[PDB]
Amino acid sequence: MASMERFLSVYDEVQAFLLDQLQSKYEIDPNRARYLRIMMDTTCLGGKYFRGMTVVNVAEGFLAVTQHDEATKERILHDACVGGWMIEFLQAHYLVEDDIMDGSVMRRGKPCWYRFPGVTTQCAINDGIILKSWTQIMAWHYFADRPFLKDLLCLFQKVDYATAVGQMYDVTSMCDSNKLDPEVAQPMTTDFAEFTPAIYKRIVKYKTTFYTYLLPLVMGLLVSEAAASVEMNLVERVAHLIGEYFQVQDDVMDCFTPPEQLGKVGTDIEDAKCSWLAVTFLGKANAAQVAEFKANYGEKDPAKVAVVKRLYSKANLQADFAAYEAEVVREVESLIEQLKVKSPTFAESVAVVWEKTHKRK
Amino acid sequence: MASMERFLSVYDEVQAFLLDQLQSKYEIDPNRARYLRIMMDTTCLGGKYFRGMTVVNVAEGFLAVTQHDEATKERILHDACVGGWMIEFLQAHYLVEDDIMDGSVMRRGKPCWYRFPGVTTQCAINDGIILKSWTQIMAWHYFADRPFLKDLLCLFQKVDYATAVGQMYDVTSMCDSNKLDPEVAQPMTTDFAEFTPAIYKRIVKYKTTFYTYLLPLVMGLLVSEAAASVEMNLVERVAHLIGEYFQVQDDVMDCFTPPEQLGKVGTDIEDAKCSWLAVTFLGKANAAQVAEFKANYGEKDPAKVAVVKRLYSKANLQADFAAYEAEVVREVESLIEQLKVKSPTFAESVAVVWEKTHKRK
Ligand SMILES: COc1ccc([N+](=O)[O-])cc1O
Ligand SMILES: COc1ccc([N+](=O)[O-])cc1O
Ligand SMILES: [Zn+2]
Ligand SMILES: [Zn+2]
Ligand SMILES: [Zn+2]
Ligand SMILES: [Zn+2]
């Protein structure tokens, strides 16, 4: 059975289980069951499923080299699909809440969930909470008897926590750390001293690499009972490296990819985000350029946004991106070589993840 | 050691553990650690700690009749305090998110967290997420080796889910179920046909009885390794009964308790909530009264709110409350008697919970 069709078929199974359980144990009525079905579809479907499918692909790699009864193969793949949907539902939770937090308009070509006329922020915040709860409901149901349940739940909850911490790093990245204070409205930085590579790297590591790369890779190992097969320190290092490259790409696209192709209007400049573009620009600008950047960054005024985009273009950040990319290639190939020492099979799965990430349009 | 002082001392311990771990494993800086410390204090402290202290009191009851080394007594009480703080932090998550969802102004005499000048909704939604994540972080740390860990985490996550489902029941209680539709802005009911005792009971059961009464009672049993000591069906029944009475009291106070004593301005009438007052009024009103209620309910206009409060007063709902209270007393005393069959000790703990709830100002 092709991997994607299996993964989509398990979605339908998981949805039916969750909604039937709401009817049989939570006293839900059919109209609210329908609302939640539509909410689940709208928030969980329509992406590329890169995260969930990585769990499946890692498990497939091990199936190819490990002796198993057919029924065991099917159980492992089913577990990989359920675990993959746990990650997709976790992402769906974060996108629902983040779109509300940020006042975002569009997501994947459609209005953000909270903007649907019959949803509203009042319902959408709670819908996002339900999405997160569903990750646990499906784990307890499908993995109740599994040897990996404890490790999987502990990993999942540490990754979720890291992600929430990273969101804090992200939403506060345009303020001076020494002025953070719940009692005092937060001004934007004027010196941009905290727009550094190390600080940027911390934001990205926590806000997206744990849930986008580390969690799918390790979940694939856990459902395969293969985690002792690998050097976990190398898995972490390669996850954080590839995840950072993925975010740098997203940052560049926020500014330069047409909104029709991107699926939203990028607002990182207006929002004064600590983006790879801003950090790298400040890493090579002269004094006059820095001053012009400070005069225009972080303002909704489209004229000022236009000055910033021109500063970026004139600064030839394309060349910095190429140099960054070439270094990531060196380092990821090195880590893949190191992963071959204990598991050539897993190293190949990581090579596939890198190729997909690197070649992403 | 007095129970409350022990419970508060464990708060300081848990806070220090969480913040130290953020520094040592999550790369946090001191100013963000300070923000999160203030967030934790502001959102978790200042209530009566009824929920968390119930865990401690249930555990104390069993300690009085069970043979244990002193060090075991101390471990059980410490676990009960950590588990109690898990519930308090879960509540703190729900109050942060609910105040945002509802546009609330005050909570416990202070501004709602999201209203603090240096917080804002953008940060506060995520702060609420961190609060929930902390419930799991503390469980894995303090209960890692405990026999009850699996049961406790499974219970906790089912109660959290029930609570989120109940919030959906609550926020949709003024709409006609057959018209729920993410695509269509939701009108308020005009017939109020779904303002019934059974529908009200479903809202309250899920939105507050699971986390306010069932979870503390059963967590107290789990940290005492005493759950086989009791009839779990009776624990559920008495939790749902006492929890409903607790919410009816809250509903009456929303309308009639002065805001200085209540700690907020009640807006259930303006928000068109399915409250005990509205259901009970509609259960005894004549046609003219029903028509006047429909003409004024669910509007911010203070003149209309005033008509509703007068309708309630003229309807002598005080007498319905007294009859409701007398029936709850009968039923709770009956369930306590039944609990004595297998555990007089636990029955007494429940009697104490009821007395505290019943005598609440
Ligand atoms: C977590 O795995 C992945 C994450 C992202 C991509 N990508 O192509 O962007 C591919 C992956 O297999
Ligand atoms: C969950 O236990 C309790 C809940 C509420 C109260 N009360 O007095 O409101 C007392 C309790 O011991
Ligand atoms: Zn965001
Ligand atoms: Zn972006
Ligand atoms: Zn509410
Ligand atoms: Zn209330």
Side-chain angles (χ1 to χ4, degrees), chain A residues 1-24 26-47 49-72 74-107 109 111-144 146-157 159-167 169-178 180-187 189-200 202-228 230-252 254-259 262-263 265-299 301-309 311-313 315-317 319-341 343-354 357-358 360, chain B residues 1-24 26-47 49-72 74-107 109 111-144 146-157 159-167 169-178 180-187 189-200 202-228 230-252 254-259 262-263 265-299 301-309 311-313 315-317 319-341 343-354 357-358 360:
Chain A
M1 185 177 191
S3 305
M4 175 61 66
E5 283 74 12
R6 183 191 296 268
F7 189 67
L8 294 179
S9 294
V10 171
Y11 177 85
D12 282 359
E13 179 183 357
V14 170
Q15 175 173 93
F17 158 74
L18 293 171
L19 297 175
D20 172 81
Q21 186 189 71
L22 281 164
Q23 166 215 72
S24 77
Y26 291 84
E27 295 170 48
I28 206 168
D29 57 283
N31 286 289
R32 285 178 179 81
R34 173 172 51 79
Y35 177 100
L36 287 177
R37 178 174 57 66
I38 297 167
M39 187 270 288
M40 191 186 306
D41 290 349
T42 303
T43 63
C44 295
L45 302 178
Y49 314 116
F50 288 134
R51 291 164 191 79
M53 282 300 296
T54 295
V55 184
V56 177
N57 291 332
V58 167
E60 289 172 323
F62 286 110
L63 287 180
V65 303
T66 308
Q67 304 207 318
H68 295 296
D69 283 341
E70 184 66 24
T72 300
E74 286 292 308
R75 182 250 300 157
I76 292 171
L77 293 172
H78 194 274
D79 289 351
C81 289
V82 171
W85 282 112
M86 291 177 59
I87 305 178
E88 294 289 331
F89 277 49
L90 184 65
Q91 177 167 239
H93 158 81
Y94 273 110
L95 303 182
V96 166
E97 305 297 357
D98 189 63
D99 282 343
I100 301 169
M101 286 170 34
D102 301 344
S104 303
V105 178
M106 304 290 285
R107 163 82 62 187
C112 302
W113 179 241
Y114 77 98
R115 296 189 57 245
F116 277 55
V119 177
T120 80
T121 298
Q122 183 177 227
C123 291
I125 292 175
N126 198 63
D127 289 340
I129 295 177
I130 288 170
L131 284 163
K132 165 166 276 172
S133 292
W134 277 337
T135 69
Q136 307 302 284
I137 299 300
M138 80 183 66
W140 285 103
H141 176 71
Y142 290 103
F143 301 152
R146 293 289 193 275
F148 57 77
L149 179 57
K150 182 174 173 171
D151 288 337
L152 189 150
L153 287 178
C154 185
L155 164 73
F156 198 90
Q157 297 177 350
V159 162
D160 173 49
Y161 182 48
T163 304
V165 172
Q167 278 301 322
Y169 293 154
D170 193 48
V171 65
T172 63
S173 66
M174 69 294 303
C175 302
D176 290 350
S177 293
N178 51 290
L180 298 169
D181 183 350
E183 299 281 324
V184 177
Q186 293 290 291
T189 186
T190 65
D191 65 15
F192 290 91
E194 296 178 55
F195 277 45
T196 69
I199 288 166
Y200 176 74
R202 186 185 68 167
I203 297 170
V204 173
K205 180 182 164 168
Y206 290 92
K207 83 161 174 179
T208 169
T209 78
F210 280 97
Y211 93 90
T212 299
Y213 288 93
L214 183 66
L215 184 56
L217 288 175
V218 179
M219 189 168 315
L221 293 170
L222 291 173
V223 303
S224 304
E225 301 186 65
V230 310
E231 191 77 65
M232 196 59 56
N233 283 339
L234 288 180
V235 178
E236 293 164 350
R237 280 163 61 199
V238 81
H240 296 316
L241 184 59
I242 298 174
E244 190 185 287
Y245 178 85
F246 173 87
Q247 189 59 58
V248 171
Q249 269 216 50
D250 270 357
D251 287 358
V252 171
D254 191 277
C255 186
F256 290 112
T257 298
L262 196 62
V265 177
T267 55
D268 284 355
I269 294 170
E270 292 96 324
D271 297 337
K273 304 303 291 282
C274 183
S275 70
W276 180 87
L277 290 166
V279 174
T280 303
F281 174 83
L282 291 171
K284 73 191 292 190
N286 66 36
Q289 293 173 284
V290 171
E292 193 173 11
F293 175 92
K294 290 178 181 176
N296 291 266
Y297 202 65
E299 304 258 319
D301 183 340
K304 294 182 169 181
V305 173
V307 174
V308 174
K309 292 203 188 182
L311 281 171
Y312 287 171
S313 318
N316 190 27
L317 300 184
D320 302 85
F321 182 87
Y324 173 75
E325 178 185 15
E327 179 60 23
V328 175
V329 162
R330 273 174 69 79
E331 289 182 308
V332 178
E333 291 179 357
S334 189
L335 286 169
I336 289 167
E337 290 299 297
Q338 292 281 17
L339 284 167
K340 287 175 182 173
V341 171
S343 184
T345 299
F346 183 73
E348 181 56 32
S349 294
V350 172
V352 165
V353 166
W354 170 238
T357 300
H358 189 195
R360 180 163 71 101
Chain B
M1 185 177 191
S3 305
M4 175 61 66
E5 283 74 12
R6 183 191 296 268
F7 189 67
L8 294 179
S9 294
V10 171
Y11 177 85
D12 282 359
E13 179 183 357
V14 170
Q15 175 173 93
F17 158 74
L18 293 171
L19 297 175
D20 172 81
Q21 186 189 71
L22 281 164
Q23 166 215 72
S24 77
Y26 291 84
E27 295 170 48
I28 206 168
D29 57 283
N31 286 289
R32 285 178 179 81
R34 173 172 51 79
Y35 177 100
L36 287 177
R37 178 174 57 66
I38 297 167
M39 187 270 288
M40 191 186 306
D41 290 349
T42 303
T43 63
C44 295
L45 302 178
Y49 314 116
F50 288 134
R51 291 164 191 79
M53 282 300 296
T54 295
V55 184
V56 177
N57 291 332
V58 167
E60 289 172 323
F62 286 110
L63 287 180
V65 303
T66 308
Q67 304 207 318
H68 295 296
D69 283 341
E70 184 66 24
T72 300
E74 286 292 308
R75 182 250 300 157
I76 292 171
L77 293 172
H78 194 274
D79 289 351
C81 289
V82 171
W85 282 112
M86 291 177 59
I87 305 178
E88 294 289 331
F89 277 49
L90 184 65
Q91 177 167 239
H93 158 81
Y94 273 110
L95 303 182
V96 166
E97 305 297 357
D98 189 63
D99 282 343
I100 301 169
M101 286 170 34
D102 301 344
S104 303
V105 178
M106 304 290 285
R107 163 82 62 187
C112 302
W113 179 241
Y114 77 98
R115 296 189 57 245
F116 277 55
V119 177
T120 80
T121 298
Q122 183 177 227
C123 291
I125 292 175
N126 198 63
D127 289 340
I129 295 177
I130 288 170
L131 284 163
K132 165 166 276 172
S133 292
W134 277 337
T135 69
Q136 307 302 284
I137 299 300
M138 80 183 66
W140 285 103
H141 176 71
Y142 290 103
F143 301 152
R146 293 289 193 275
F148 57 77
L149 179 57
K150 182 174 173 171
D151 288 337
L152 189 150
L153 287 178
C154 185
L155 164 73
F156 198 90
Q157 297 177 350
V159 162
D160 173 49
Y161 182 48
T163 304
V165 172
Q167 278 301 322
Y169 293 154
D170 193 48
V171 65
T172 63
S173 66
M174 69 294 303
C175 302
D176 290 350
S177 293
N178 51 290
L180 298 169
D181 183 350
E183 299 281 324
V184 177
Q186 293 290 291
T189 186
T190 65
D191 65 15
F192 290 91
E194 296 178 55
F195 276 45
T196 69
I199 288 166
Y200 176 74
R202 186 185 68 167
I203 297 170
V204 173
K205 180 182 164 168
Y206 290 92
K207 83 161 174 179
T208 169
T209 78
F210 280 97
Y211 93 90
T212 299
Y213 288 93
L214 183 66
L215 184 56
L217 288 175
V218 179
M219 189 168 315
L221 293 170
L222 291 173
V223 303
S224 304
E225 301 186 65
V230 310
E231 191 77 65
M232 196 59 56
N233 283 339
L234 288 180
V235 178
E236 293 164 350
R237 280 163 61 199
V238 81
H240 296 316
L241 184 59
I242 298 174
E244 190 185 287
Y245 178 85
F246 173 87
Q247 189 59 58
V248 171
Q249 269 216 50
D250 270 357
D251 287 358
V252 171
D254 191 277
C255 186
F256 290 112
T257 298
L262 196 62
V265 177
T267 55
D268 284 355
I269 294 170
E270 292 96 324
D271 297 337
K273 304 303 291 282
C274 183
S275 70
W276 180 87
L277 290 166
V279 174
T280 303
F281 174 83
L282 291 171
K284 73 191 292 190
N286 66 36
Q289 293 173 284
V290 171
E292 193 173 11
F293 175 92
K294 290 178 181 176
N296 292 266
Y297 202 65
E299 304 257 319
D301 183 340
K304 294 182 169 181
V305 173
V307 174
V308 174
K309 292 203 188 182
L311 281 171
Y312 287 171
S313 318
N316 190 27
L317 300 184
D320 302 85
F321 182 87
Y324 173 75
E325 178 185 15
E327 179 60 23
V328 175
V329 162
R330 273 174 69 79
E331 289 182 308
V332 178
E333 291 179 357
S334 189
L335 286 169
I336 289 167
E337 290 299 297
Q338 292 281 17
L339 284 167
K340 287 175 182 173
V341 171
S343 184
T345 299
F346 183 73
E348 181 56 32
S349 294
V350 172
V352 165
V353 166
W354 170 238
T357 300
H358 189 195
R360 180 163 71 101

